[PDB]
Design a protein around this ligand. Structure first.
Ligand SMILES: CCCCCCCCCCCCCCCCCC(=O)O[C@@H](COC(=O)CCCCCCCCCCCCCCC)COP(=O)(O)OCC[N+](C)(C)C
Ligand SMILES: CCCCCCCCCCCCCCCCCCCC(=O)O[C@H](COC(=O)CCCCCCCCCCCCCC)COP(=O)(O)OCCN
Lengths: 75, 66, 93, 487, 70, 615, 76, 51
């Protein structure tokens, strides 16, 4: 049971229910795939590189360093 | 065979009210046992005095005024 | 192009605002509202710092936290009465 | 420099370009519409990046004269409250375009044009800081939605549903317009920043508040007027329902947040028990009526009324947990609910039916759909790690601090919400197959897999780290909590 | 049978149509009158009284006078 | 090293469920078993380091929810209490994973079963290692979701789906109670973290306005939390889901319902002990509910004939015992009995599943008998488990149940007497049905069929290693851990458990009572064993009384049908709510009443009005 | 059956058994090992031990936050 | 495998019988050994060293 090679050469059913293309060829992309993929790449780039690089401007940060300052001036 | 209007929600030896009476009796067993426990009054039959701790019942170590 | 660093806010009550008739100078009203929000957030963060102090007093001390963190716990609970937009206990700022 | 002008002009250019393109060029129409929607979405995402989160002043303000004496003018501006609404209403449009990708040959150019005009009108609604023009773009959405419901409806019922929706919206709209006119005559202008610094006599607060509530409560169906929503929602295309539930249901709550909770702080307090009473019974009644529905799209449509009435409990609590946590629920609802209608749209496109009786055992024939459907079932039933739980719990802690009883009644909403949400999934997905009724199946294609991806990512990202969204709003929602208060 | 569309049944379709065309099925009997006058007229009043009294008791506990919720 | 303890099951599940098509039925088993086993060994080092080394670790990753002060970060808290639950949960999960390799050898969808088991283990680890009330809630509801998914793992069945949905509804009421309790916690202390709440749990002495009532702030919160504990632990109020939840696979019963997720309520009560200690009113409720649950499960489990269902009522009784052991404000004994039971009940479920699987999935004790010679190993293992369960002297079940009973005796109060009486009678009932299960399945003359006996095969290696490990545990672990957990003045718990000096009765439990009280459980167990033998092995079978006495038949039906809970509760709540959904809310409120006064019911008189304009 | 061999599922389907599950199993371990390294490195950095251990524990090899929070009066 | 009347009973392997007997014997020996050590204590005949 734990040594015999399996019978299913390839997983049952095609992925996204699409037949594999002709041999020596490639899956021709639809008219929407390229714009959607460049959009999804630019979204990740902008969010990862923009949100992590924008300054930490917030009311939970300025107020934190103002309270941490007035909390010690009381002594 | 037209379907029923309420065709979306569909212990045979007992009825709902008879089984409710049986359940009420079963829970009244617990209630009566609780009343018997009250009637026993085990609080007045404790064989030892309440435990007394030093340093005024550990007032300081329990958050009391220093 | 904002300058690099934390935001800078003038910490002073906007002159010209009088609580007798608040709806007199509209600009002083919005400035006063922003200012009051800022000190309420300052109070909130001070309460949060006291909460952190209590949190690490409970863990470092252990069983003895009842006598060692009493001083901090009462300060934190005194500082959480006038937090802000919370329970009906509202600060008279 | 990205401002509100370009974001609004992009759908204009998109709709104009397709207006003068021959209908025989079906490919070009779809490509240009999708490209315009994606460009608008990227523009909104960029506008998020440069959004200051330390000032309560409106940002990216733009002005355009309307009356000759500048009494009323086009004032466009966004704050921490309406920024995410703009992002969501620009993100939902490309999904709606992609929904009708295969069958677009029959709809024609009038489909993308209608949706782009819709996007144009909804972007300006969340950006207007003028009370009158907010009404003008508030009720300009009827024409594109009327056309969408009628022209591309499913059955002959489309005439009745469109009439009913139009009539209800009109009766709310004009009763609001009278109040807007009375405010304009008394104050002098209609600028929001000026109307928020004008003292209203106590007698006029109740009348104006009631008149505003009449129009808003229709678009956030409270109790007496949630009978147009089910019919108009079921008699709508798959992408049409996404717009109606995703955005059109967010006008009422946004209208309350922007023009009611601040312009009348005294009137809001007096009517707080009234809103709590309506919302508490709406949560109980609607989440219970959902159990005895048999239509797939009429069950999820009843899952929005309970969720949207849970939002109005949060807004009227008037604290950071309540108001701040109610915004996350609408962003979560705008993603969870609109994703559920995509799942129903997937089932309807293949098998032209919506009765739950015909569906069963899809777990063995459509496994990718079952996995995706189950995930949004969990989100709809307020599971932790999902964006719905963060909003749902923050509203409860915001209302318990004000009234323990209303937080108790609203807590039974998740008891009933988890009842039908899983019970629907058991019927549709789990169980045995019924080859007598339907026998041919096809799991999710490339579009459906890709379409659900931003919903999957955007639902857990908000569900495990909602600090990204929360920290952008606290400066803006805290100034909203107190307006008449000075202590 | 080369079609994905369901083989709809007359009984199920008619049952669903009847369950969706219930708008025109009132007779205005005493059962409907009592039902809409109790579970639609009294429960909202009971709930509203509940919240109003909860606010009143919160107000009296702090010593502040009752708030005019009208 | 401590993040690996929590996230190895998550990674194993995420691999075996997303890429199971490349690993098959063997690679998917290997991934989850290896990941959970590595988490188990890491929990062993965690026990050597935190519990024995007395150095707790506190780990915060990132803030989760950050309102003005509603801070519930992604924090993990490993103290003495947490580590015990770790070494229990993860070890039992690894043994169940190893058991399911051979149990799910012919089932087609084995990889999804193992993915579900791993995700359940991950959720339980998030539950036990929770620093906040929200991460605890996250695990508390993820564990319910995982149990629901695993109960109807065979989605084709209808009874499995009904049991799963009933379990979800009951756990949802429990979650509502827990959510109300958490909301109460934040309203008082303005925090959900355990450290701050437990530090400031003594100062508040105020009263709230809750649902038109003026109650005590701490007492209300404790009662609301106990409602959630009742929902998850299957106590007197909400327990019907547990017996019905046996429709799932046997490894689901052994892990999901025996060792873990039923002890979640007990663990939450024990962890929140620095808060429950200041609400004496809640402790009375806890004691009463635990005693009622123990007695009721003991009475219900004596007449069941299904092999799996008898053990479920044993689990319910043990959980009731733990609950009212917590109610006497002795949480060390509760956790000790929890850890003890998680051994000899997992062993019982695994051995019962080994019997069932070899018997062609025959679950009725009326159709098995004389299996002792055929199944030597499994008979011995079930003997060990049953002897531990009944509380045989000098065994794992003797060092905890006897202590609980003698502690209940010395709690000289009204609530303590009730718990002592019910827990004393429940010992006799537990002995009776445990020995009946042992007798009918193994020692009575054969009542099975020829085909079942012909196709017999004892447990192979993957189903025998977890059994043997659990047998060694149920033999020695109770004695080994007796001193550290329920010893006098032990500092093993450190600050994990708080017991106030006033309500400390552990010392008097040992030398303040007659020796008869310390021997009552043994005498009652012997009486129950004798009764079971005399009614099963040799008897005239006077069952003719059940055929001639109307009361006897109804009495037999009462105990068999779960005290008429499922029938009565269904008709009077579920059916009533189903009618409340359609016959009123959909039929009258919004059907035509709004329509008739709306835009077309009577507003269509404009047709009868516009046409009259010709006048 | 006959049609369940034409359905693609992430889990693999009924009685799934690929020809090269041994090689795939070895890769999956290595992938899990590679993603577990940063988690272990992250855990050893953010973990805090207020109390010195009774005996030398293995976590002192990598963790360095031992007896650091003893001055809780200056916590943020 | 022994057939009496058609039906046959497969004899268990040596590993199972040996393991079961060994575990049962270990349990019995442990119970008796514990009864030797602290058996009088639970009977109340003698405290450990209390008195
Ligand atoms: C969101 C926070 C909580 C997350 C909880 C996750 C719990 C799992 C949720 C999804 C479980 C799947 C349930 C819906 C699908 C029902 C079963 C199904 O069809 O799924 C497929 C697909 O397999 C799966 O179930 C994949 C989904 C689960 C694996 C992915 C989970 C990854 C870990 C959980 C998420 C990680 C973070 C969790 C903590 C936030 C399996 O099919 P088969 O077992 O092969 O049998 C079907 C018969 N036939 C082949 C003929 C079609
Ligand atoms: C193939 C998929 C198959 C199914 C997969 C299921 C889901 C798996 C993936 C889960 C989602 C992962 C998302 C990350 C969640 C955890 C990390 C939170 C993000 C984070 O902490 O970083 C913040 C944002 O940066 C960032 O990293 C932002 C980048 C995130 C990009 C997400 C793009 C989603 C697109 C949704 C569009 C619609 C949006 C909703 C309107 C900055 O942190 P900070 O604020 O503290 O800054 C501190 C500066 N000193």
């Amino acid at each position: 049971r734990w040594a015999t090679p399996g019978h299913e050469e390839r997983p049952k059913g095609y992925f996204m229910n699409r037949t594999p293309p002709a041999p020596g060829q490639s899956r021709k992309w639809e008219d929407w795939e390229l714009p959607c993929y460049i959009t999804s790449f630019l979204t990740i780039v902008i969010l990862g590189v923009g949100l992590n690089a924008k300054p930490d401007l917030s009311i939970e940060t300025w107020a934190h360093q103002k309270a941490l300052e007035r909390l010690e001036m009381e002594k | 065979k037209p379907l029923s209007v309420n065709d979306e929600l569909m212990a045979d030896t007992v009825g709902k009210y008879e089984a409710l009476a049986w359940l009420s009796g079963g829970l009244g067993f617990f209630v009566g046992l609780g009343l018997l426990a009250v009637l026993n009054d085990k609080a007045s039959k404790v064989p030892f005095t309440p435990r007394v701790y030093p340093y005024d019942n550990l007032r300081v170590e329990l958050g009391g005024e220093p | 192009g904002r300058k690099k660093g934390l935001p800078e806010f003038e910490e002073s009550a906007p002159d010209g605002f009088d609580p007798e008739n608040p709806y007199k100078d509209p600009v002083a009203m919005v400035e006063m509202r922003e200012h009051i929000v800022r000190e309420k957030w300052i109070q909130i963060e001070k309460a949060k710092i006291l909460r952190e102090k209590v949190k690490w007093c409970y863990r470092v001390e252990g069983v003895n936290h009842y006598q060692k963190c009493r001083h901090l716990v009462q300060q934190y609970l005194d500082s959480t009465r006038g937090v802000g937009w919370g329970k009906d206990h509202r600060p008279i700022s | 420099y990205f401002n509100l002008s370009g974001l609004i002009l992009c759908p204009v250019l998109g709709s104009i370009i397709l207006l003068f393109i021959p209908n025989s060029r079906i490919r070009l129409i779809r490509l240009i519409g999708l490209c315009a929607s994606l460009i608008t979405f990227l523009y909104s995402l960029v506008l998020w990046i440069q959004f200051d989160s330390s000032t309560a002043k409106f940002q990216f303000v733009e002005s355009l004269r309307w009356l000759p004496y500048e009494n009323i003018n086009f004032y466009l501006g966004i704050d921490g409250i309406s920024l995410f609404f703009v992002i969501l209403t620009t993100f939902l449009i490309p999904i709606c375009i992609l929904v009708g990708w295969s069958g677009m040959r029959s709809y024609g150019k009038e489909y993308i044009i209608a949706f782009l005009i819709c996007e144009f009108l909804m972007i300006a609604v969340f950006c207007m800081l003028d009370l009158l023009l907010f009404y003008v773009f508030f009720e300009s959405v009827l024409i594109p939605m009327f056309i969408i419901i009628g022209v591309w409806g499913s059955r002959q019922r489309k005439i009745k549903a469109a009439y009913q929706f139009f009539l209800y919206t009109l009766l709310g709209s004009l009763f609001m317009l009278l109040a807007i006119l009375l405010i304009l005559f008394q104050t002098g202008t209609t600028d929001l920043q000026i109307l928020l610094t004008t003292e209203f006599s106590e007698r006029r607060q109740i009348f104006l508040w009631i008149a505003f509530f009449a129009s808003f409560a229709v678009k956030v169906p409270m109790v007496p007027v949630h009978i147009w929503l089910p019919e108009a929602h079921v008699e709508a295309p798959t992408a049409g329902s996404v717009i109606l539930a995703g955005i059109l249901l967010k006008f009422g709550t946004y209208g309350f947040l922007r023009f009611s909770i601040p312009m009348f702080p005294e009137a809001t307090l007096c009517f707080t028990p009234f809103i709590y009473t309506l919302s508490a019974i709406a949560i109980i009644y609607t989440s219970l009526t959902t159990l005895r529905q048999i239509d797939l799209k009429k069950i999820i449509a009843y899952s929005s009324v309970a969720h949207m009435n849970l939002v109005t409990i949060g807004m009227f609590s008037l604290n950071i947990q309540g108001i701040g946590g109610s915004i996350l629920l609408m962003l979560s609802h705008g993603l969870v609910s609109s994703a559920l209608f995509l799942c129903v749209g997937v089932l309807y496109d293949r098998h032209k039916t919506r009765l739950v009786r015909y569906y069963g055992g899809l777990v063995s024939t459509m496994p990718n759909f079952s996995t995706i459907f189950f995930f949004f079932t969990l989100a709809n039933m307020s599971l932790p790690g999902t964006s719905s739980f963060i909003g749902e719990f923050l509203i409860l802690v915001g209302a318990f601090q004000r009234n323990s009883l209303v937080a108790t009644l609203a807590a039974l909403g998740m008891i009933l919400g988890a009842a039908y949400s899983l019970w629907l999934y058991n019927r549709v997905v789990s169980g045995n197959l019924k080859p007598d009724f339907l026998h041919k199946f096809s799991d999710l294609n490339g579009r459906e897999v890709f379409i659900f991806i931003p919903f999957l990512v955007g639902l857990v990202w908000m569900g495990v780290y909602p600090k990204v969204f929360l920290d952008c709003m606290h400066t803006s929602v805290s100034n909203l909590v107190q307006h008449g208060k000075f202590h | 049978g080369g079609g994905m569309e369901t083989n709809k049944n007359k009984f199920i379709e008619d049952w669903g149509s009847a369950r969706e065309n219930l708008e025109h099925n009132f007779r205005w009997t005493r059962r409907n009158f009592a039902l809409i006058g109790i579970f639609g007229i009294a429960l909202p009043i009971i709930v509203y009284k509940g919240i109003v009294k909860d606010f009143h008791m919160q107000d009296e506990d702090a010593g502040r006078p009752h708030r005019k919720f009208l | 090293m401590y993040l690996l303890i929590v996230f190895l099951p998550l990674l194993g599940s995420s691999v075996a469920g997303f890429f199971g098509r490349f690993l098959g039925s063997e690679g998917s088993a290997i991934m989850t078993t290896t990941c959970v086993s590595f988490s188990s060994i890491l929990s062993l080092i965690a026990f050597y380091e935190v519990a024995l080394g007395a150095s707790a670790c506190y780990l915060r990753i990132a803030p989760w929810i950050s309102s003005e002060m509603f801070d519930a970060s992604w924090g993990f808290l490993f103290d003495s209490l947490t580590v015990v639950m770790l070494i229990v949960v993860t070890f039992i999960s690894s043994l169940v994973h190893l058991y399911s390799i051979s149990y799910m050898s012919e089932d087609p969808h084995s990889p999804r079963f193992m993915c579900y088991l791993s995700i359940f283990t991950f959720f339980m680890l998030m539950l036990v290692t929770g620093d906040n009330f929200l991460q605890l809630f996250l695990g508390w509801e993820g564990v319910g979701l995982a149990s629901y998914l695993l109960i109807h793992f065979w989605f084709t069945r209808l009874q499995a789906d009904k049991a799963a949905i009933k379990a979800m509804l009951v756990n949802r009421v429990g979650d509502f109670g827990l959510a109300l309790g958490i909301l109460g916690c934040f309203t008082l202390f303005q925090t959900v973290d355990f450290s701050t709440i437990f530090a400031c749990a003594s100062v508040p002495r105020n009263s709230w306005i809750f649902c038109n009532m003026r109650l005590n702030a701490i007492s209300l919160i404790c009662i609301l939390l106990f409602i959630g504990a009742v929902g998850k632990s299957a106590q007197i109020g909400l327990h019907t889901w547990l017996p019905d939840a046996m429709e799932g696979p046997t490894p689901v019963s052994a892990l999901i319902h025996a060792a873990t997720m039923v002890t979640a309520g007990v663990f939450m009560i024990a962890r929140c002990s620095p808060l429950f200690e200041y609400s004496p009113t809640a402790l009375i409720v806890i004691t009463f509910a635990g005693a009622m649950t123990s007695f009721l499960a003991a009475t219900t489990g004596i007449l069941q004939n299904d092999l799996k269902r008898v053990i479920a009522y044993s689990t319910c009784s043990q959980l009731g015992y733990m609950i009212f052991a917590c109610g006497i404000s002795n949480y060390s004994v509760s956790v000790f009995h929890l850890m003890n039971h998680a051994f000899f009940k997992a062993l019982l479920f695994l051995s019962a599943g080994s019997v069932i699987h070899a018997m062609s999935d025959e679950q009725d004790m009326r159709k098995m008998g004389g299996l002792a010679s055929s199944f030597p190993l499994t008979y011995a293992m079930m003997l060990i488990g049953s002897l531990s369960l009944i509380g045989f002297p000098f065994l794992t079940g003797f060092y905890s149940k006897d202590v609980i009973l003698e502690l209940a005796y010395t709690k000289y109060t009204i609530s303590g007497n009730f718990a002592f009486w019910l827990g004393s009678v429940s010992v006799l009932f537990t002995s009776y049905y445990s020995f009946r299960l042992l007798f009918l399945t193994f020692l009575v003359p054969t009542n099975s069929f020829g085909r079942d006996i012909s196709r017999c095969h004892d447990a192979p290696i993957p189903m025998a290693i977890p059994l043997i490990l659990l047998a060694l545990g149920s033999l020695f672990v109770g004695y080994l851990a007796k001193d550290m957990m329920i010893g006098l003045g032990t500092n093993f718990w450190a600050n994990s458990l708080l017991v106030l000096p006033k309500n400390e009765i552990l010392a008097e439990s040992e030398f303040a009572a007659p020796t008869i009280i310390k021997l009552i459980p043994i005498l009652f167990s012997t009486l129950g064993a004798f009764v079971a033998y005399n009614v099963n092995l040799v008897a005239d079978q006077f069952q003719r009384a059940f055929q001639t006495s109307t009361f006897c038949n109804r009495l037999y039906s009462f105990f068999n049908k779960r005290w008429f809970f499922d029938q009565v509760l269904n008709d009077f709540l579920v059916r009533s709510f189903l009618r409340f959904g359609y016959e009123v809310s959909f039929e009258a409120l919004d059907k035509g009443a709004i329509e008739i006064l709306g835009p077309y019911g009577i507003s269509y008189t404009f047709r009868r009005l516009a046409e009259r304009i010709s006048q | 059956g006959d049609f369940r061999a034409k359905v693609w599922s992430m889990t693999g389907g009924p009685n799934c058994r690929p020809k090269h599950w041994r090689r795939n199993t070895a890769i999956a371990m290595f992938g899990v090992f590679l993603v577990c390294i940063p988690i272990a490195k992250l855990s050893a950095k953010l973990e805090q031990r207020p109390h010195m251990p009774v005996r030398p524990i293995p976590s002192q090899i990598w963790c360095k936050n031992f007896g650091t929070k003893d001055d809780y009066e200056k916590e943020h | 495998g022994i057939t009496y009347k058609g039906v046959t009973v497969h004899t268990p392997k040596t590993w199972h019988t040996v393991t079961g007997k060994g575990l049962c014997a270990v349990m019995w020996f442990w119970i008796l050994y514990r009864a030797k050590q602290d058996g009088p204590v639970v009977m109340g005949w003698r405290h450990p060293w209390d008195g």
